[PDB]
């Protein structure tokens, strides 16, 4: 039982759980047809905005560590993510949607503090609730 240094500095480096607060965290695999998405091997000199390895290593037992509340997007645990630039700019910089560029990227599970589901359709399709919040300055009660 080495528990090889492949798990040791790649078991999170306890990072992104405490880095770019370790929640909102969500969907979408360790890899499928390698042509398209991208800033794959291009996030300026690192892959600080992607991940490297190991579904069995960390996710099975890593632990509860470092949070924000519950859950649930679409589904549950098999393969996940890493970034600081979540739901709004999570999708003007990566992972467009439905199906995608390449052939239709697939699946994962989330947990932030905004109460609800899917994480694909309404939250993650270049939704400019930044440029449609100068719409609220007179809405819902005013004369």
């Amino acid at each position: 039982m080495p528990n090889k240094r492949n798990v040791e500095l790649l078991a999170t480096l306890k990072e992104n759980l405490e880095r770019a607060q370790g929640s909102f965290f969500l969907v979408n695999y360790q890899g499928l047809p390698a042509k398209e998405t991208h800033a794959l091997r291009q996030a300026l000199k690192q892959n600080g905005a992607r991940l490297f390895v190991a579904k069995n290593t960390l996710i099975r037992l890593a632990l509860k560590e470092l949070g924000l509340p519950e859950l649930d997007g679409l589904q549950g645990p098999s393969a996940v993510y890493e970034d600081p630039v979540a739901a709004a700019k999570t999708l003007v910089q990566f992972a467009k949607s439905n199906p995608k560029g390449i052939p239709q990227v697939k699946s994962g599970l989330l947990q932030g503090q905004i109460l609800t589901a899917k994480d694909v359709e309404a939250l993650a399709e270049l939704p400019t609730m930044d440029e449609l919040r100068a719409e609220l300055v007179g809405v819902l009660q005013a004369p």
Partner: peptide, 30 residues
């Protein structure tokens, strides 16, 4: 000038900040 107080006082987070929070208060009030 004031595209910079109204594009940067709401990008204390590029993501859900007050950003996703008057989508949830346009939601709460009719």
């Amino acid at each position: 000038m004031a595209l910079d107080i109204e594009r940067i006082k709401e990008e204390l987070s590029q993501a859900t900040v007050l950003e996703l929070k008057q989508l949830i208060d346009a939601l709460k009030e009719a």
